[PDB]
Design a protein around this ligand. Sequence first.
Ligand code: EWY
Ligand code: ZN
Length: 257
Amino acid sequence: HWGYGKHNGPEHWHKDFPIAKGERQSPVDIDTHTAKYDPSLKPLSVSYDQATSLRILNNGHAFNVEFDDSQDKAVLKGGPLDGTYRLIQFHFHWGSLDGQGSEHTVDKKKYAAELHLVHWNTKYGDFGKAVQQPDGLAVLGIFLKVGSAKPGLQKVVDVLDSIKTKGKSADFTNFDPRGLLPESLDYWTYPGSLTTPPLLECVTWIVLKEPISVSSEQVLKFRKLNFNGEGEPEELMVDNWRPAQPLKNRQIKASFK
Ligand SMILES: Cc1cc(=O)[nH]c(SCC(=O)c2cccc(S(N)(=O)=O)c2)n1
Ligand SMILES: [Zn+2]
């Protein structure tokens, strides 16, 4: 029953998931002026050439594009990470209006949407074990602004009408996630959490400084999805973002400047 409505949205989550008020919750506002440059941070290594997408799923909260993570085919390493993390899925958060939708903010600015490419640390052998560990996940976050279309997004947008409602899925092979990346891999990083229940404090966040542009029509199509199942009243899947959480005792590190 958690979700993003008036009665079960983010401000309610702590009653089922008390870690919602924990010490390393996400997202957060990224104060660009107070981010610490760390000249010992390494370039991020994104190795997506052998990625294998499988399926796209409407889970009732967002849509996931899922990958075969049974081998080291699409991996993230380097950057602030020790060892190697396997891509398991990506998804987005977005708004009802172009002026909101991102989970992280930059100097309090909201983007129209945010892409999360979720990876798990191979030393834990699977995603369900990894989320129980403080260094189990590496989530690469990329902001979306509305402007020119992103052509490598259009395969995703065009399949959405087949997964409109909660529970629907569709085969989704040969999707190349390199088409969703901006030119620069400059990033911020900080230790945080999943941004939806169960809110587990298992994530190394890596947030790219450069947003990708998508067109207004591409984001409009995300807003035609539904939170409800087929044959239930229509509740459009919009504003599926958690607001910024207290930074507490954390420092955001920058790979640049
Ligand atoms: C329950 C389940 C089964 C599975 O096979 N795969 C997954 S992937 C879960 C996931 O990627 C995710 C789960 C919750 C939150 C976030 S976020 N917004 O990037 O912090 C990501 N979940
Ligand atoms: Zn997410």
